[PDB]
């Protein structure tokens, strides 16, 4: 009767339909049909995308491609364990509050201009959504902002209130793409290439340094007139105590370890996963440290997203087992060698920074990374390029709401119109699209 | 400065110590010292017994024991996901309100009379605990229970209030060694030694129909006044609703394929770990159904007890790895060749009978459950009798409070006093000590 039980018995039946249909050997045919189930159920999301995540082992269990046992411990991939650390290491600084302190501190560096106020809420909005999340992030910034444009109150000036809004809904999502913790993307891209975090480091920072200036610009350069206004620093002021000066000093030297994690671990007996003993070290020593509880963690961590993790890897190892990457590498031979890698890593980041638009950013990142990571395989090429590029390219949702929580988020506030969001978020769109495609070029040789 | 900041200290020095002057091969060593410092890190839980669930791995990877990815893939075994079926089972019915509606039609069957009233209270704390949990039966069952005894409000007739009490939290506790879903020793041994679902009932059942009677019994003839007073049903009735009949129909078919698992997967193809199929068939049934949304299956799942089973297995394989099994089976030989079986029983049953009382009943089963498993495999006994006896027995916590959630549940009701627990448990753990030796020595040809 609902729309969502429609769209999964429609599902249901392209599935039997391709299976019975399809004129191929049947591994291949097994693979397609399961490939479309799974990519319409994640665009769609008739079920949740946990659910359709738990859905993708419980197939290839019964369809034979892979044992009960060897489909489950997916869900055991050392990445799914850095992301938990990186949840744990969240929840710590904000039970602990040391996400407002950042904030305040910051804020208060600006002395009550609201020139220099936007600027540096988008500046901290950004550095906070490195570690936290983004859906955080934002619900985070809001009341921060709505305390910050409260004194050019006049929503008749309307074209501040969206230049302050946008702004930091952007800033936590290009944030987002600065560090392996952050968005979820980036963790199934460097599941699927295997990626360490100084690795994903070394590519995404320097995007976000160069998206969010361009962002700031773009938003700018529509309707802003912020130049005037004064500053409202209505509340109790923040003052570091039973350690938030240890919260501190863990976070600092997690994040150093993982930054030098390849010599120390090749100065150490190289051990396997080193990113991912350093995040359950800082896990371990946040508990130590008595600086925060077990139940605060289980809180904060999505649980959901650390399944669809899983759940993505098993999608990506059907698609080996079953042959339908190497079925659909030669089936795009003629294509991509009539094309250029330039025309193609264009037609990628155009597809999903326009995709992500219409569905969930990680539900889009764990459709097309194996997809993409595994036919690259098949062609040969190393599938870090079109994997990072995707997983960048699924965090650039800019249009509508819905597109990203942070976008709902400021969308609530009962201000923004959607023609405006609508139509800056098309100018930031083909923005990415250039600067994606320009430093895909660039990291190459 | 904390206690348990020096319980930690305490212990490092204690693993230093047996590392550094124990006079064995390496690995003995090692494993040796590893197990005496979770021991004490999950006796005393001076970390959150998940804490030291995933200090477990980063040793064993440190120490050279297992490579990163392969001490990983323990938090994957089926029986973690058989569990958070359950989970999920439980979630549905309770946000359903299915639990609500089988204490109204249960408890109203009784007319009018006290005498039928807290008897069908124990009944129904004993069934549902068979699916839902321990602490989270208490809890829900503490307002129907001070409901019905307040119409004897007299609390100078203490006695009728505090049998009451201390009736429901133990009919959750024998409850909840029914079946696999319940509490998670049960699931400790299961994936220890790989039991079934139906396997660990055939065991369970009979042994909790044995023990709810004993319990009554025992409760009882101490000091009961209950043959006397009236009914109070005041709050408003219960009704199936949208589908409440359909949660029931999904977990009717779910246990019924959990029971006729063995024919039905034989003549299926022989699936690997069939029951975890069907908890997570489960989770998707009631996802398709609509009848339960993820968010109560992210709130209802206790993670941490996931990630504990894993971690207990890990120690396992850790004990294994490292030759420990095999040392501590040689130090015992003479010890255990010296008694009988019976004899071995009888010490272990009471050991865990009253161990369970000062610390936590899963944490006690995750520690002893592998030690016992594999030094009963490195004698080449069958492993299962003395899992599952362990596992029946840590849920034998009747004394004091801070035994079990349920004790301090209802204890908190600011009236049953320290010593009548304290005695009322002293009684029921020898009460069990006999029927679980009893029972234990029947089950064997
Ligand atoms: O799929 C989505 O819509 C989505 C999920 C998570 C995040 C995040 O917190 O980084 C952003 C977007
Ligand atoms: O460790 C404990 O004290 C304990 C944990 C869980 C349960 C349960 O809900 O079955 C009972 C007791
Ligand atoms: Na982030
Ligand atoms: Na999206
Ligand atoms: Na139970
Ligand atoms: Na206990």
Redesign the pocket.
């Known amino acids: 009767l609902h729309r969502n039980s429609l769209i999964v018995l429609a599902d249901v039946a392209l599935f039997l339909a391709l299976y019975h249909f399809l004129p191929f050997e049947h591994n291949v045919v097994l693979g397609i049909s399961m490939l479309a189930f799974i990519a319409v159920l994640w665009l769609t999301e008739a079920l949740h ?1 946990t659910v359709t995540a738990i859905l993708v082992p419980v197939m290839a269990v019964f369809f034979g491609i892979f044992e009960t046992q060897a489909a489950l411990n997916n869900f055991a991939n050392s990445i799914i364990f850095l992301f938990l650390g990186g949840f744990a290491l969240a929840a710590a600084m904000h039970h602990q509050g040391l996400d407002k302190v950042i904030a305040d501190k910051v804020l208060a560096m600006a002395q009550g201009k609201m020139s220099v106020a936007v600027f540096m809420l988008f500046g901290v909005t950004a550095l906070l959504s490195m570690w936290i ?4 992030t934002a619900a985070m910034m809001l009341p921060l902002v709505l305390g910050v444009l409260s004194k050019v109150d006049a929503d008749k000036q309307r074209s501040t209130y969206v230049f302050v809004l946008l702004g930091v809904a952007y800033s936590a ?1 290009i944030g ?1 793409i600065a560090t392996l913790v ?3 993307p980036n963790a199934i891209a460097a599941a699927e290439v295997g990626l360490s975090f100084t690795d994903w480091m070394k590519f995404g920072l320097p995007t976000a340094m160069m998206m969010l200036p361009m962002a700031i610009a773009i938003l700018y350069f529509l309707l802003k007139p912020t130049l005037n206004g004064m500053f409202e620093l209505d509340r109790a002021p923040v003052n570091w105590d039973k350690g938030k000066v240890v919260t501190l000093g863990i976070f600092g030297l997690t994040v150093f370890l993982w930054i030098f994690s390849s010599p120390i671990n090749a100065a150490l007996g190289g051990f396997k996963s080193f990113d991912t003993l350093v995040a359950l070290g800082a896990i371990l020593m946040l508990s130590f440290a008595r600086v925060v509880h077990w139940k605060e963690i289980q809180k904060t961590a ?1 649980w959901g ?1 650390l399944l669809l993790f899983g759940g993505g890897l098993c999608l990506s190892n059907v698609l080996k087992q079953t042959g339908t990457s190497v079925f659909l590498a030669n089936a795009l031979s003629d294509m991509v060698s009539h094309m250029g890698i330039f025309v193609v890593i264009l037609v990628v980041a155009t597809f999903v920074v326009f995709l992500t638009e219409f ?6 990142a764990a459709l097309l990374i194996p997809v993409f990571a595994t036919v690259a395989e098949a062609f040969g090429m190393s599938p870090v390029l079109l994997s990072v590029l995707i997983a960048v390219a699924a ?1 650039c ?1 800019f249009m509508l709401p819905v ?4 976008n709902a988020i400021v969308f609530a506030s009962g201000h923004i119109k959607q023609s405006e969001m609508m139509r800056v978020g098309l100018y930031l769109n083909i923005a990415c699209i250039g600067l994606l495609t320009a430093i895909a070029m660039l990291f190459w040789q």
């Open positions: 995308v999340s983004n859906t955080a999502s987002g952050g968005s979820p999505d997203v569905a969930s950013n990680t539900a889009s965090s949702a597109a990203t929580p942070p």
